[PDB]
């Protein structure tokens, strides 16, 4: 997911700009987004949210708006238990498990059900589970005493002022997520949100792995208040952003450093190339108009190529294999953009899969390692050119196996297909540097692949008076069997042809095609 908020001083018209851009599976049911608009005499909200949720997570109205991105807040701890004498060893003593005898029904293939017993055990940490390898693990989840998550979101998205917004956010009922805010007043804000347990020792890596379940030394009981978490409001740089990267470069120049917070709140790992792009796209541009803002969102640069081809190409041209030389010249002529007509992009991805691993996040292959001191220009270079050329040799074979050639048009293999609509793809993997994301699946027998995850709900809002906003939903607004609103937006997505989002009654009445009157009590 991506998120941008721009202050008035950085825009041409003096109105804050906001980008909602969550990235999630195109198939997982509970991750499906739905676009809607609610209006009553006392409030108005427009936006997307996961199906089943009664409140809009990605909302905006005439006054304010917010967006979210995953921060992976570590709000739970898995503890390795030491089983002994019918209980578990804790602080040198055997402690008893708390346990109720439950039961549930299991539907059989023939439609009937059978009753199955289920013993539920809990240690001081929390419910106990047993892994396949026999490890006994107790999971402790924070915020199980916070029943107001839905109302907090509701109060946040209908706040009459930034102060009211912060007051609601401060209730700490939303357990995770980075949240970005912007309003017509000109205020922008970034908050590393969630319910974080207060710990006396251990860094994030420690708390993410199996923690010793035999000592009260690791049993946390309190959580951090909002003021203890990384936050940024109206920074000197005039913008805030987050593309899932650790919260250390939310704006530029930065307003805090890792040393200002507990080491267990967030990782200090290398920022993805997409995240590096996010910071550059915002910091390097000024006098932004909504139009330009939207154009920048479509960025699909093969940043990884900029970091590696300078060293790879020369090294590859040394190889006597005519095929390797050809591949190098193909990669050399490439403008390093993930366009539909790119004939070098597929081959590059295949080389990158080997150079940086299947998820493209590997760091071992670079010559110069990532550094927080050069957050948007590292890592860089190829550490072992000779080994990298051998990887290219293998990549050439892999590209041919998957796509049938080393120079197949990116958009011929990469397609977005929903029902009977089949359109050319562009942009790609975020870890390769693409800001606009389409995590292409493995190809089929024809070498055709489609997005499994990526751009879903995409919207850009300018808080002028009245507000002006545009957006699109990759997989439509409905997934019910036979609906005509599942594949009806993907063609526009393939041309980056955004819909004007309609909030004003006059606009809605002009676009309405179906009316459902109703009543309730």
């Amino acid at each position: 997911s991506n998120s941008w908020a721009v202050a008035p001083g950085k825009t041409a018209n003096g109105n804050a700009l906001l980008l909602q851009n969550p990235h999630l599976s195109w198939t997982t049911d509970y991750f499906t987004y739905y676009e809607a608009h609610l209006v009553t005499p006392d409030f108005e909200i427009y936006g997307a949210t996961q199906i089943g949720l009664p409140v809009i997570r990605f909302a905006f109205n005439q006054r304010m708006g917010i967006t979210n991105t995953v921060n992976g807040m570590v709000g739970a701890t898995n503890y390795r238990l030491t089983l002994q004498d019918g209980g578990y060893l804790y602080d040198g003593q055997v402690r008893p498990f708390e346990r109720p005898q439950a039961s549930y029904r299991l539907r059989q293939a023939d439609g009937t059900t059978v009753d199955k017993p289920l013993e539920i055990r809990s240690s001081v940490h929390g419910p106990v589970f047993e892994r396949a390898d026999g490890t006994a693990v107790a999971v402790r989840v924070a915020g199980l005493d916070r029943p107001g998550m839905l109302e907090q979101y509701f109060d946040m998205i209908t706040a009459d002022s930034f102060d009211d917004y912060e007051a609601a956010l401060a209730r700490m009922q939303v357990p995770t997520f980075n949240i970005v805010y912007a309003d017509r007043e000109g205020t922008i804000n970034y908050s590393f949100n969630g319910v974080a347990p207060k710990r006396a020792e251990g860094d994030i890596a420690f708390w993410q792995g199996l923690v010793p379940g035999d000592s009260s030394r690791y049993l946390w009981t309190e959580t951090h208040p909002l003021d203890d978490l990384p936050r940024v409001t109206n920074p000197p740089g005039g913008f805030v952003q987050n593309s899932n990267d650790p919260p250390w470069t939310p704006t530029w120049p930065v307003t805090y450093t890792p040393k200002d917070f507990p080491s267990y709140l967030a990782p200090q790992t290398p920022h993805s190339l997409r995240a590096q792009q996010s910071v550059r796209l915002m910091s390097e541009n000024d006098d932004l108009t909504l139009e330009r803002f939207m154009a920048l969102q479509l960025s699909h640069r093969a940043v990884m190529a900029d970091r590696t081809l300078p060293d790879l190409i020369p090294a590859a041209l040394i190889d006597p294999d005519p095929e390797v030389q050809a591949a190098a010249r193909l990669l050399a002529a490439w403008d390093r953009e993930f366009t539909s007509d790119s004939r070098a992009a597929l081959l590059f991805e295949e080389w990158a899969r080997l150079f940086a691993g299947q998820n493209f996040a590997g760091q071992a292959g670079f010559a110069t390692p990532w550094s927080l001191d050069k957050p948007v220009s590292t890592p860089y270079g190829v550490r072992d050119p000779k080994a990298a050329v051998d990887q290219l040799r293998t990549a050439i074979a892999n590209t041919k196996r998957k796509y049938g050639a080393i120079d197949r048009p990116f958009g011929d293999a990469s397609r977005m297909i929903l029902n009977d609509v089949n359109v050319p793809g562009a942009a790609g993997y975020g870890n390769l540097g693409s800001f606009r994301v389409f995590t292409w699946s493995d190809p089929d027998e024809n070498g055709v692949r489609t997005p499994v995850h990526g751009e879903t709900w995409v919207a850009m809002i300018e808080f002028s008076t009245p507000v002006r906003a545009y957006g699109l939903m990759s997989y439509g607004n409905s997934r019910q069997p036979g609906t005509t609103h599942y594949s009806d937006q993907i063609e526009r997505v393939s041309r980056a042809d955004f819909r004007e989002l309609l909030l004003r009654r006059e606009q809605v009445e002009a676009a309405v095609q179906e009316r459902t009157p109703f009543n309730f009590k």
Partner: protein, 153 residues
């Protein structure tokens, strides 16, 4: 000075050409009811299936493919905690949650042939079901996934 706010005088959903619902309500509960109605029409099958799972009845309704999640949720006391969270809601907000569920039930009742046969057994849904799904999504999917605890990736 923002533009003047619209004041609905009747409850209605105005759908645009892309199936986007513009829900107008005379009060809060009315808007939530229309929203539940709209969501059911657009994503009813999956919403009902998910609410069924949040009840800890996935295995009961659909079998083995849903059993692991059933064990995960029951062991973590999700269904019961949801009932508690529901009871702990402020009167006003609980009314909105009830309305939302009511909207889902109403759509299903008005268009029985449009609800997938396999999920009809889930109806009717309640405000507690709504709280349960949100609780599952936030705390037992996002924050604490079964994969991380079971070490199954």
């Amino acid at each position: 000075a923002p533009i003047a706010a619209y004041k609905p005088r009747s409850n209605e959903i105005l759908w645009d050409g892309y199936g986007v619902p513009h829900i107008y309500g005379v009060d809060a509960p009315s808007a939530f009811y229309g929203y539940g109605w709209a969501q059911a029409r657009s994503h009813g099958d999956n919403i009902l299936r998910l609410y069924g799972e949040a009840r800890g009845k996935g295995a009961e309704y659909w079998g083995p493919d849903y059993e692991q999640t059933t064990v995960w949720l029951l062991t973590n006391g999700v269904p019961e905690r949801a009932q508690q969270w529901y009871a702990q809601q402020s009167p006003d907000f609980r009314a909105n949650l009830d309305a939302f569920a009511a909207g889902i039930n109403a759509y299903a009742q008005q268009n029985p042939d449009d609800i997938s046969p396999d999920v009809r057994q889930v109806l009717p849904v309640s405000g507690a079901d709504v709280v349960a799904h949100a609780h599952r999504l936030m705390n037992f999917l996002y924050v604490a996934s079964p994969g991380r605890t079971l070490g199954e990736g």
